[PDB]
Amino acid sequence: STGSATTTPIDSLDDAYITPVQIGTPAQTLNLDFDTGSSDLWVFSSETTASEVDGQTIYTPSKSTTAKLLSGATWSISYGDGSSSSGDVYTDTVSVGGLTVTGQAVESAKKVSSSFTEDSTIDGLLGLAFSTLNTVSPTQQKTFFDNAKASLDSPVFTADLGYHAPGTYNFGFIDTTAYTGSITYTAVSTKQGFWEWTSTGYAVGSGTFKSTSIDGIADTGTTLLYLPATVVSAYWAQVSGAKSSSSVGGYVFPCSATLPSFTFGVGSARIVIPGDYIDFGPISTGSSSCFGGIQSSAGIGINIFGDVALKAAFVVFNGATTPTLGFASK
Numbered sequence: 001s002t003g004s005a006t007t008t009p010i011d012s013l014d015d016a017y018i019t020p021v022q023i024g025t026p027a028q029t030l031n032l033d034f035d036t037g038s039s040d041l042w043v044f045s046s047e048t049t050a051s052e053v054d055g056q057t058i059y060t061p062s063k064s065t066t067a068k069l070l071s072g073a074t075w076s077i078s079y080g081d082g083s084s085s086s087g088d089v090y091t092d093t094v095s096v097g098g099l100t101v102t103g104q105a106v107e108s109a110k111k112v113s114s115s116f117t118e119d120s121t122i123d124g125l126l127g128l129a130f131s132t133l134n135t136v137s138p139t140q141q142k143t144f145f146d147n148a149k150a151s152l153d154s155p156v157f158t159a160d161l162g163y164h165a166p167g168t169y170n171f172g173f174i175d176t177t178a179y180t181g182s183i184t185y186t187a188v189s190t191k192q193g194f195w196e197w198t199s200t201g202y203a204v205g206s207g208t209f210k211s212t213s214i215d216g217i218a219d220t221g222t223t224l225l226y227l228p229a230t231v232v233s234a235y236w237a238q239v240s241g242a243k244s245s246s247s248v249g250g251y252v253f254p255c256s257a258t259l260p261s262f263t264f265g266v267g268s269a270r271i272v273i274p275g276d277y278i279d280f281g282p283i284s285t286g287s288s289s290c291f292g293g294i295q296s297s298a299g300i301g302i303n304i305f306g307d308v309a310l311k312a313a314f315v316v317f318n319g320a321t322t323p324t325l326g327f328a329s330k
Contacts, residue, residue, distance in 0.1 A: 001151045001199055002172035003099025007034065007161065010121040011240075013280055014307060015067045015223050017161060018121060018168055021292045022095040023106055028077070030057050030123035034169055036159070036195055036317065039133035040077050042085055042107035043124035044116075055120030061108065075107045075218050077137045078299065080222065094144060096126075098169050101148050105134075105141035111291060118265050125221065125293040128317065132141065145171070147321060149271035152179030155319045158219055160330070161311035163277055179314035179328035184269035184302030192302075194219070195317060197325050198268060199305075202227075209270070214229030216303030218315060218325055224280070225262070225273070226297035226304040235262055235294050242292070243321050248283050251292040255282060264309060266327040273312040 007019040018031035023043070029042055044053060046060040061067035076086035087110035094104040105135045109124070116122065127134070131142045149155045152172030159169040161179050168178070187194045194217040199309030203209040214227065232251065237244040238260050242253035253259070259275030277294035293308040 001097055001148075001165065002153055003097035003148075004168060004170045005097030006165045006166050007169055008225070009162070009164065010107045010119070012164070014161075014164060014311065016122060017167070017220070017307070018123075019096070019123045019126070021126060023059055024061070024092050025066040025089055026064075026301070027095070028057075028059055028064065030059060031121065032124045032126040033122050033221060034128055034159075035219070036128040037217060037219035037221045038077065038079065038128045039127040039131055039193065040075060040107050040124065040135055041105065041124070041126045041144055042075065042077070042087070042109055044112070045087070045108040046163075047087060048109045048294055049111055052117045057123045059106065059108065061092065061106075062199065064092055066102075067106075070136075070139075073105075073139060073141075073228075075133045075137070081115070083113045083115040085109045085116060087111065089141070093325050096144065096171065099148055099152075100127060101144055103209045104144055104147055105136060106282070107136065127193065128220070130190050130193045132190070135188075138257040139160075139240070145317075148172075149319055156321070157317050159310060159315045159317065161307055163274075163311050167311070170249065174316060181329055182269075183314070183326040183328040184287070185265050185316070185318070185324045185326045188325055190323060192202075194302075195323070195325055196312075199240050200230055200265030203263040203270075205275075209263065209265065211265075214264075216297075216305050218317070219304050219306050220310060222304045222306030224304075224306050225294045226300055226306065227294065228300045229296045231314040232294055232296045235260070236292065244296075245316060248289070248291070248296040252283060252289045253292055255288045255290040269327065271291050271313045271327055272328060273309060277308055
């Protein structure tokens with residue numbers, strides 16, 4: 001089997017991407033944030049504290065003839081950005097782009113943090129990291145991909161995120177029309193539960209390529225590109241007037257600037273992030289100070305190849321017995 005679904009930016013900045021997901025019988029379609037940095041499929045629901053729902057579409061398990069309470073199971077998750085959610089668990093039928101899993105754990109939120117409430121466009125998350133990170137207790141549950149894998153034509157999914165435009169998540173096949181050149185595959189460590197890999201270096205604009213190993217994670221659920229402070233300083237030094245602002249929380253730059261591109265290495269291959277992908281717009285409405293899309297990972301504890309990086313590539317998440325990651329230009 002295979003599946004193919006369009007993923008759409010939630011706003012004009014590509015702050016996140018939402019993908020429609022069918023849950024239950026009859027189907028209830030929710031727009032979920034596909035997150036290769038976590039491993040829980042959780043949704044706003046009829047059980048979510050009413051004051052914490054503000055415009056989201058909810059899953060109502062009592063209206064699904066295939067929903068079953070997973071007795072005694074609870075979940076609770078905290079994300080890198082400080083947001084969180086928790087609740088109980090149902091199993092139900094879940095379909096993405098025509099690919100159906102029966103008995104998928106659907107984690108129903110009883111509580112969500114303010115950032116989730118305040119984002120009316122995201123009805124929940126669909127985790128695509130390794131199932132070892134799943135938070136369901138006392139019996140850990142599998143991700144949608146893990147459940148689907150054996151049925152797929154090939155044990156893979158691909159992320160093809162757009163810049164200020166829709167893109168695609170495919171399951172079970174590689175669309176050879178969706179990228180240019182070849183796909184370069186690189187090793188993955190699953191030790192921390194992430195799609196963790198090592199970039200071979202970087203360049204800023206038309207500058208020379210610096211060969212240096214940068215361990216980090218391919219994370220569709222993180223907006224920006226978080227890299228070591230040395231790398232980030234080298235980038236922003238090429239933008240007149242750019243500075244790190246403790247008050248704002250990262251590098252900012254004059255909105256009048258033209259940003260240089262940023263290149264990262266995948267083996268001997270190179271992925272080029274155009275400068276415009278690194279512009280996250282005014283820090284507040286009407287400001288002429290703009291927020292940068294490349295930020296320091298110092299104090300995160302891990303480098304993160306988030307959407308800024310991934311949307312410059314066609315990315316293969318290869319879930320073979322020994323997982324690997326593939327990157328192509330597009």
